[PDB]
Structure 1
Amino acid sequence: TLIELLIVVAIIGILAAIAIPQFSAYRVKAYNSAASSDLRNLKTALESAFADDQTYPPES
């Protein structure tokens, strides 16, 4: 019936706007926490290399 096809339309419009959130910060935090962990790891690498050669490794 036409009234049924007037409520189908009235629910499609509702379920098409459910305040979809932006997933931008929630991922840049992950990127940042990857970089920070990587740096804290690289520090271990550097300080072990010094304890090998009494010198931090040359660049490149």
Structure 2
Amino acid sequence: FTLIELLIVVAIIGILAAIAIPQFSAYRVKAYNSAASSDLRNLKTALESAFADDQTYPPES
């Protein structure tokens, strides 16, 4: 509308364009880690189930 109105908008667009976007890197690597430790604690039950069938842990591959 008025030149002064178009001077507040550009003064607010500048504000709302920098709101300290956080580093969402550590908060995701923790999920990837806790998939692998879960997966290992599960894998152990398969190994120690298979031993109590065969008196041996499985052959590799």
Paired residue secondary structure (1:58): coil
User: 1:46 deviation in Å?
Assistant: 0.1
User: 1:41 deviation in Å?
Assistant: 0.2
User: 1:47 deviation in Å?
Assistant: 0.1
* CA–CA separation in structure 2 for the residues paired with 1:27 and 1:36: 15
* CA–CA separation in structure 2 for the residues paired with 1:18 and 1:41: 42
Per-residue CA distance 1:35-58 (angstroms, 9 max, x = gap)? 000000000000000000000000
Structure 1 portions without partners, runs of 5+: none
Query: What's the TM-score once normalised by structure 2's chain length?
Result: 0.97
* CA–CA separation in structure 2 for the residues paired with 1:27 and 1:5: 40
Aligned residue pairs: how many?
A: 60
Paired residue secondary structure (1:49): helix
* CA–CA separation in structure 1 for the residues paired with 2:10 and 2:54: 74
Structure 2 portions without partners, runs of 5+: none
